[PDB]
């Protein structure tokens, strides 16, 4: 019923489990959010995404702004109505994808100018334009617009990028607030930057706390620093963010990354891996990923994972899916993606249950032992 309310039900070490109540629904945390790139979670109907246990999905602000356009979607009734998803939606600021998929990017204090990677150039993105677009889409959790620091980054480089983003965090905060409809029904998350330098991350965390946000995201990770660095950064970074506010690790999604991140205080995750690998032929199982294309699954009558309760493992065998994917059939992409998303949602449930029960440390240990 409330606009945003985070409640921690249980803790174990730095890990915690709880819920985020929003107008459109409850979000059980640690939570994993499927990524819906072009107003659709690849190869899945919204009902199918809900069936796997997903409480929230992530929307793209860059992508959607180019096709079909923010203003267009608003006119049509908003992303929710447009895609058929009635629960909360968190939308990226667009800044990251601009710098990765845009042609001739132009950085400046006011924002970034770029060329759409497909048809001319839907061109300008600034803190306030980002917040506007996200309002037009009608997202429940809005991400402040920032400047991601590439890896590696020198201290001065990291410093100047972090400083800029904090200025942009303030601007995002103001923009968000000026739109009453948005400020009253949505939530705004700030993003900590600073690369791998704790002094920088500390500065970023303090700035952010001074401005004040509903949730704090740890940006800058999963950009090539490797699990070891990531975890090292998470170690000192997450304790810098308000404990009573959700911590969201952006773009982190290998099953072992999630488990390790939750051990360090992360509550929300998002990643294209489950959907991506699914189209690719890679299925996640409790015993490690398997590539269904491999000849040894040609006549395997067992489900993708014998402990997985998803619709695909309950109704089809590895042999059929193996065939589907090798034949290039759409159904294979559908079934694989459904399975991977279901797997990730089961992993988040197991994490949540183990934390509530004070046995997350043993679960992580057992998880890693069998998965690897
Ligand atoms: Zn399954």
Swiss-Prot record:
It catalyses: 7-aminomethyl-7-carbaguanine + guanosine(34) in tRNA = 7-aminomethyl-7-carbaguanosine(34) in tRNA + guanine. Pathway: tRNA modification; tRNA-queuosine biosynthesis. Zn(2+) binds at residues 308, 310, 313, 339. GO terms for molecular function: metal ion binding; tRNA-guanosine(34) queuine transglycosylase activity. Binds 1 zinc ion per subunit. The keyword Metal-binding applies. Keywords: Glycosyltransferase, Metal-binding, Queuosine biosynthesis, Transferase, tRNA processing, Zinc. The active site is at residues 92, 270. Residues 251-257, 275-279 are annotated as: RNA binding. Substrate binds at residues 92-96, 146, 193, 220. GO terms for biological process: queuosine biosynthetic process; tRNA wobble guanine modification; tRNA-guanine transglycosylation. Its cofactor is Zn(2+). GO terms for cellular component: cytosol. It holds the Pfam family TGT. PANTHER family: QUEUINE TRNA-RIBOSYLTRANSFERASE. NCBIfam families: Q_tRNA_tgt, tgt_general. Belongs to the queuine tRNA-ribosyltransferase family. Homodimer. Within each dimer, one monomer is responsible for RNA recognition and catalysis, while the other monomer binds to the replacement base PreQ1. Catalyzes the base-exchange of a guanine (G) residue with the queuine precursor 7-aminomethyl-7-deazaguanine (PreQ1) at position 34 (anticodon wobble position) in tRNAs with GU(N) anticodons (tRNA-Asp, -Asn, -His and -Tyr). Catalysis occurs through a double-displacement mechanism. The nucleophile active site attacks the C1' of nucleotide 34 to detach the guanine base from the RNA, forming a covalent enzyme-RNA intermediate. The proton acceptor active site deprotonates the incoming PreQ1, allowing a nucleophilic attack on the C1' of the ribose to form the product. This is Queuine tRNA-ribosyltransferase. It comes from Zymomonas mobilis subsp. mobilis (strain ATCC 31821 / ZM4 / CP4).
């Amino acid at each position: 019923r409330p606009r945003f309310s985070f409640s921690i039900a249980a803790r174990e070490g730095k890990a915690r489990t709880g819920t985020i109540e929003m107008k459109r629904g409850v979000i059980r945390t640690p939570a994993f959010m499927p990524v819906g790139t072009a107003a659709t979670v690849k190869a899945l109907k919204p009902e199918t995404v809900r069936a796997t246990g997903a409480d929230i999905i992530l929307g793209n602000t860059y992508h959607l702004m180019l096709r079909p356009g923010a203003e267009r979607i608003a006119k049509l009734g908003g992303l929710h109505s447009f895609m058929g998803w009635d629960r909360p939606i968190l939308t990226a600021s667009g800044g990251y994808q601009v710098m990765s998929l845009s042609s001739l990017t132009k950085q400046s204090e006011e924002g970034v100018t770029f060329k759409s990677h497909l048809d001319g150039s839907r061109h300008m993105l600034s803190p306030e334009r980002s917040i506007e677009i996200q309002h037009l889409l009608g997202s429940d959790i809005v991400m402040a617009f920032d400047e991601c620091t590439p890896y590696p980054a020198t201290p001065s480089r990291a410093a100047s990028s972090m400083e800029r983003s904090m200025r942009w965090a303030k601007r995002s905060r103001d923009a968000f607030d000026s739109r009453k409809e948005q400020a009253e029904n949505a939530a705004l998350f700030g993003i900590q930057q600073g690369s791998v330098f704790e002094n920088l991350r500390q500065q970023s965390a303090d700035a952010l706390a001074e401005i004040g946000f509903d949730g704090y995201a740890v940006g800058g990770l999963a950009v090539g620093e490797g699990q070891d660095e990531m975890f090292r950064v998470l170690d000192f970074s997450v304790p810098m963010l308000p404990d009573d506010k959700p911590h969201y690790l952006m773009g982190v999604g290998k099953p072992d990354d999630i488990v390790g991140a939750v051990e360090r205080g992360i509550d929300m995750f998002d990643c294209v891996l489950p959907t991506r690998s699914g189209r690719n032929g890679q299925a996640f199982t409790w015993d490690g990923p398997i590539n269904i294309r491999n000849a040894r699954f040609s006549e395997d009558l067992k489900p993708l994972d014998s402990e997985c309760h998803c619709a695909v493992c309950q109704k089809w065998s590895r042999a059929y899916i193996h065939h589907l994917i090798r034949a290039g059939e759409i159904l294979g992409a559908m079934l694989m993606t459904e399975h991977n998303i279901a797997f990730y949602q089961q992993l988040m449930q197991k994490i949540r249950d183990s934390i509530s029960e004070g046995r997350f440390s043993q679960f992580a240990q057992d998880f890693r032992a069998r998965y690897f």
